[PDB]
Amino acid sequence: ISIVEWKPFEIIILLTIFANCVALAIYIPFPEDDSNATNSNLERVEYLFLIIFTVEAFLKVIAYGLRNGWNLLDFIIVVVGLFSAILEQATKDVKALRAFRVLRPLRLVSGVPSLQVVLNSIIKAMVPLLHIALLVLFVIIIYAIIGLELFMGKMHKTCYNQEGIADVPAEDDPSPCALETGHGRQCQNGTVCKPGWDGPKHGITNFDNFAFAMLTVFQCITMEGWTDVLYWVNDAVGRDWPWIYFVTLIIIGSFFVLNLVLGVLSGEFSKEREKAKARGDFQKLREKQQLEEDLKGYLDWITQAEDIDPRWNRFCRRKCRAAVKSNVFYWLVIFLVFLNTLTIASEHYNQPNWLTEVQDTANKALLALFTAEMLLKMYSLGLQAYFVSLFNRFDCFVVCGGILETILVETKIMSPLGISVLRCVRLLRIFKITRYWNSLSNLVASLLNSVRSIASLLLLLFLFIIIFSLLGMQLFGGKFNFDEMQTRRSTFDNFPQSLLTVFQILTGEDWNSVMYDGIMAYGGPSFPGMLVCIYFIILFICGNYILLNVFLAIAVDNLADAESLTSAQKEEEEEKERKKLARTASRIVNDTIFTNLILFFILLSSISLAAEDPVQHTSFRNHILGNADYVFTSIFTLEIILKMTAYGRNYFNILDLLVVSVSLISFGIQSSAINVVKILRVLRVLRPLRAINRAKGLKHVVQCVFVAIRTIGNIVIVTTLLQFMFACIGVQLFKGKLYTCSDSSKQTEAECKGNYITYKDGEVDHPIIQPRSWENSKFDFDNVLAAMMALFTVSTFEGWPELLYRSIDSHTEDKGPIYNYRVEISIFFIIYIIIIAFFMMNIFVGFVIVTFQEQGEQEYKNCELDKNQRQCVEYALKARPLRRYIPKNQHQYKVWYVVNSTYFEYLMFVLILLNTICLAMQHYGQSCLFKIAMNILNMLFTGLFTVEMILKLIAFKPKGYFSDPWNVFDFLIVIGSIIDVILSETSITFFRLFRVMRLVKLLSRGEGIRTLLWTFIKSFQALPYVALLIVMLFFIYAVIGMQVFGKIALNDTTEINRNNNFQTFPQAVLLLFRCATGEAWQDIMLACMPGKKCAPESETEGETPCGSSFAVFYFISFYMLCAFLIINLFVAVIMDNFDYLTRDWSILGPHHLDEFKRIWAEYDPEAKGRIKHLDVVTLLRRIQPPLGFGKLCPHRVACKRLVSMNMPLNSDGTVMFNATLFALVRTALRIKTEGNLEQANEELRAIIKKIWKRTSMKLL
Ligand SMILES: CC(C)CCC[C@@H](C)[C@H]1CC[C@H]2[C@@H]3CC=C4C[C@@H](O)CC[C@]4(C)[C@H]3CC[C@]12C
Ligand SMILES: CC(C)CCC[C@@H](C)[C@H]1CC[C@H]2[C@@H]3CC=C4C[C@@H](O)CC[C@]4(C)[C@H]3CC[C@]12C
Ligand SMILES: CC(C)CCC[C@@H](C)[C@H]1CC[C@H]2[C@@H]3CC=C4C[C@@H](O)CC[C@]4(C)[C@H]3CC[C@]12C
Ligand SMILES: CC(C)CCC[C@@H](C)[C@H]1CC[C@H]2[C@@H]3CC=C4C[C@@H](O)CC[C@]4(C)[C@H]3CC[C@]12C
Ligand SMILES: *[C@@H]1O[C@H](CO)[C@@H](O)[C@H](O)[C@H]1NC(C)=O
C-alpha cells in the first residue's frame, strides 16, 4: 500500500478535511440536550469521517510503522474520535471530548506544503519573544502579590438600603462602599454600607487570592477594563493611592512591554530582509519594473507609427493621442471625479427632494461621460495598452460595475451599495503633480508582487479564527442563556455569531465581558468552573501575536522594498540626467545665566496655570494665581523690552510676544468680563510652548517631529481617502435605519409616543412607567460627516460591537430594529477593521520605522569599518583589567569563599522563591492559625536574610559591600522588613512591600533578560526630550480640558463622575491617560457635548449651559496626536538600540569581549596591566573558540600565532590588556599580512574618537 498512499489519495483526504470542516460549522449547539434533524444527520456523517480517517491511519501505520508531529497529531485525533464514538454508543462527560474535533482544520496546514513554511515562519519568530513573556510573567506576579497585600477583601460591601439585606439596592451596577470610619465612597441618603457582598463582577474581579489577583492584573495589563478596577478600588479604600498602583502597572507592563515587543519584532524582520537582500530577491522586483516600463515605452512607440499612412484617421486619431496627454484631458477627468465625489457625498437622511433628483441625474450623466472617457482612451491608444497599467484595469472594472449595478437599483432587484464611490480612487492621481507618487506606486507594486504571501498569511489568520470559533462554539454553545432580562449579543450560539465573538476578542474590545460570561456559564468563581478562562487568555495573547506578526510583517517587509525601489528610480534618474546631459552640456539677550532663569520663570508660570480652580468662579486660590500672573508677565515683558534694544525677529519671538500681548489685552479690557475672557484664557496654554526656543534639544526634538510629519503625508492622506470611501458606502447602508424606540414593540416615530410599562429586573410584579422616546444611535450614518466619526471609533476598537449589533438589526429607513435581520452586514465592519484598523495602521507604524531607519542610518561612517570591527576596535582602545578584592587575612577569606561560591547563590535564590510562595497564599477568609503561621514563617525569612546581609557585609567590607548597587537595594529590603516585624507584633503597609522586591533580583538574571532590559532602559535614558513631548501634550490638553469642560456636573450615571472629571489637574491628566489607553474615550467625548448641567459651585442660565461642541475636535485630535507621539518615542527608543536588536549572536561582539575581562579578573587582582607568562597555555582555551580557539593544546598553529602576533611594545610579561585584546580581536576577525601595522596605526587616528596619545605604548 506504499503505492496507494501516493497520488491523489492525499487530495481525497484533504477534501474530506474540508467536508468535516463544513459539517462542523453547520452543527447548532442547543441548550440542555436539545437538537434537530440536521444535528442528528451530522452525527451520522461523523461516523463516515471517522471511518475514513481510521483507514488512513491503518494504511499509513502498516506502511511506515509517528516521528513527525503532524502524523502524530492525526493519530491522536483518530484515537480520541474512536474513544468518543465508542463511549457515546455505550452511554447512549459523554459529549465533552468532542472538542478534539476542532483540531482537524489544523490538518489543512499540514496537507499543503505551501502553508507549513508560513506557519514555521510565524512560529519561529516567537522564540525571541520568550524573553519578554518571562518579564510580563514576573511583572504580573509581583503586581498580583502587591494587590494581594493592598486590596485583599476590601471589595465585599455595598449599600444595602435600610430595611435589612434585601438585594444590593443600587441599579444593576452596585459599587463598593466604605464604613463611616472609612475613606472610601460613602452610601447615599437612604442607604447603609453593610458587608456580605459577592463582588464587583459576581466575585470574579477582586484581589482575594493569587488566582483572582493574578487575573485582574493581567486584565489590567491588556488595557481593557482597568479603569473599572481602579474606580472600584477607589470606592473601596479611597482616592489617594490606587493610581500609583494602576498607572505604574499600565506604564510598566502595557506600554514598556509593547515597546519591547515592537523592538524585538522589527529587529528580527530587519535581520531577515538583510539575509534576503544578501541572497537576492529585490533584483527580481527591480528588473521586473523596468521591464514593463519599456513595455509601456517602446510598445507605445510602435503604436504611434500605426497611423502613419503613406482610412482617414490621421485627421482625428493624431489629435486624440495629443488630447489625452495634453494636460487638458487629465484635468477635465479630475474635475469630473471631484463632481462625482461631491454628488455622492451629499446624500444625507431626509434630504430635499430636489437633491435626490439632481444627484441621480448626475450619477447617470457622469457615468455616461466616464464611459465615453473609457471608449476614447481604449481605441485611440490600443486595446491591449489599456490593460498594461493598473489604474486602467481598475477604471475598467469600476465603470463596468457601475453600468451593471445601476440597473439592479433602477428596477428594484437590488438595494444600493455605493458602487461608484470608487472613482475617488482616482483622485489619487493628483499626486502625479507631487513627488509623492513614485513612492506610493512602488508600495502598491510590492503589495501586488507579494500577493501570494499576503493571501497565505491571511489564510492562516482565518484558520486560527475558524479553529477558535469552533472550540468556543463547543465550549460555550447554548450556555450563555441566563435568566437575566438581557439577552447577550456576543455569544457562541451560531457559526457566524461565534466568528463575530472571536473577532471581537481578537480586536480586544470587551473581551473581559465575554470571559466573565464564559466563567459564569460554567458555574461561577470556583476552582473547577473558573478554569475556563485559559481559553480567553490564550486566544487573546495568541491572536494579538498573530495579528501583529501577519500585518507588521507585511507592512515593514513591503515598505522596505518600496523605499528601495524609490531609491533605485531616484539614482537612475540622476545618472541619466547627469551622463545624458554630459555629452551635450560639454544687551543681555545673549547671556547664559539669564536665559536659564527666564526658562525657570517660564516653567513656573505654567504651574500657576495648572493650579487654578475650574469650577469656583471666585475662590482664594484663584486670586493669588490671578495676582501672581502680574509679576510673571512683567518679567516676560522686561525680557521682551530688553530684546528690542538688541535687534529689530524670528518665528519664535512671534509666539513670545503673542503670549505677552494676549495677557496684556486680557488685563486691557477688564470691563467686558463675560465675553472674550473664556475665549482668551484658552490661548494661555501656549505659555509652556515658549521653552521650545530656549531649551535646545527640545528645539531639536520638535524639528524632528515636524520633519517626520511631512513624510507620512502619503499614509495620512490615503487612509483619509479610504475612510471617506468607507463612510460614503456606510451612508448608503445605514442612513435613517439606526433608530430605536424605548418600547421595543413600536417601530415608527408616529407609533412611539406616550408612556409604556417597564419591569425592573424582569420581575412581572414590579411595573414601572417610563416615557416612550424615539432615539438614534450614539454614532449614526445619516451624513457623510457622521459616518467618518462613527468609523473612527470603530477603527479605535472602542464601542464597535455596539455599533455592529445595532447595524445588524437595522432593516428599513424610518423603522425600528429587528433581531438579527442582516447578520451578513457584519462583513462591512470586518472589512473596514481589516483594511483600516489592521492594515493601514500597521503600514503607518512600519513607515515610521523605515523612515527613521533611513533618516538616522544613511550617514553611518562611509570609511570601511564593518559593523562589528568598529566596536571591537573601540573597546580595544578603551579597556582595562578588573578588580577582585581578594580578602587578605584569611580569617575573612573563608567567609568570602563561602559567600562567593556558586552554591550560596542557589541557596539564596531558593530562599527568595520560597518567600514569594509564602507571600502568594495569603487568601481572604484565612483562619487565625494561618495568619499566625504566616507571621512566624516570615520571621525566619527575615532572619536568614539579615544574617546573609551581615555575612556578606563582613566578607566584602562595608566599602566593597555597599559599592555594588545590588546590596544597597537588598539593604533597604532587609531593613524595611526588620522594622516591619517589630511594628507587626504590636500601622503602615509600605514596609510589607519590600519583601516582594526580592523577586526583582531573580528577575534580573540570565544573559537575555538582563541585557535586553538594560539596553532598553539605557536607550530610554539617552532620549529624555522625546518623552518630554508627551508630557507637554498632556499638560496642554489637560489645561484646555480644565478651562472648557471643567465645570460639568458630576453625575455618577454619566462618564463625568467623581472618578472621571476635569475639576483638577491630576484628574484631567488621569482622564487624558484613560483616553490615551483607549477606555471608552468616545463616551467621555459624548458626555462633554453641549447641553449638560453645570455645577453647584460654578454658579438661572442653568437651563444647560455646559458642554461644548469643541469636544469632538478635542478628543479626536488628542487621540491622534497621543498615538503619533507614543509611536514616535517608541521607534526612537527602538532604533537607539538597533545594534542590539540585530546583534547576530553567532559572531564576535561585546558579549564575549566583556567575558574576557572577567576571565582575566582572577589572574590579575588589580587593574595594573602586568601579565603572567604562564597564561599562554590556558588563556584562550579557558572560554571558547568564538573568542579564541577550541581548547586545543598549546602546541598548535593557534598557539603559535598567539605569540607570533607581536605584543605591542612591552617587555616580558608586561603587555597591557588593551594590546593583547586588540591582537586577539584582530586575529579573530579581519586578519592581515605583515607590513600593514602602520596602515592600522594611521587608520586608528583618522575616523575613531580621539586616542589622547594613550596608544603611544601600543604602536608596534
Ligand atoms: C470632496 C469631499 C472631500 C468634500 C465634500 C463636502 C460636501 C459634499 C459634504 C461634506 C459635509 C456635508 C454636510 C454635512 C452635514 C450636513 C447637515 C445636514 O443638513 C445634512 C446635509 C449636510 C449639509 C451635508 C451636505 C454635504 C456636505 C456639505
Ligand atoms: C487549548 C485551550 C485554548 C483550551 C483549554 C481547555 C481545557 C484545558 C480546560 C478549559 C475549560 C475547562 C473546563 C472548565 C469547567 C469545567 C466544568 C467542571 O465540570 C470541571 C471541569 C471542566 C469541564 C473544565 C475542564 C478543563 C477545561 C476543558
Ligand atoms: C515638568 C512639569 C511641566 C510637569 C507638571 C508639573 C505641574 C504642572 C503639576 C504636577 C503636580 C501638580 C499639582 C498636583 C496637586 C495639586 C493639588 C490640587 O488641589 C491643586 C493643583 C495641584 C497643586 C497641582 C498643580 C500643578 C502640578 C504642580
Ligand atoms: C506561587 C505559587 C505557590 C502559586 C500559589 C497557588 C496556591 C498556593 C494558592 C492560589 C489559589 C489559592 C486558593 C484560592 C481560594 C481559596 C478559597 C479560600 O476560602 C480558602 C483558600 C483557598 C483554597 C486558596 C488557598 C491558596 C491557593 C491554593
Ligand atoms: C445626571 O445629572 C444630574 C445628577 O442628578 C441629574 O440631572 C440626572 O440624574 C442626570 N442628568 C440627566 C439629564 O438625566
Ligand SMILES: [Ca+2]
Ligand atoms: Ca475598550
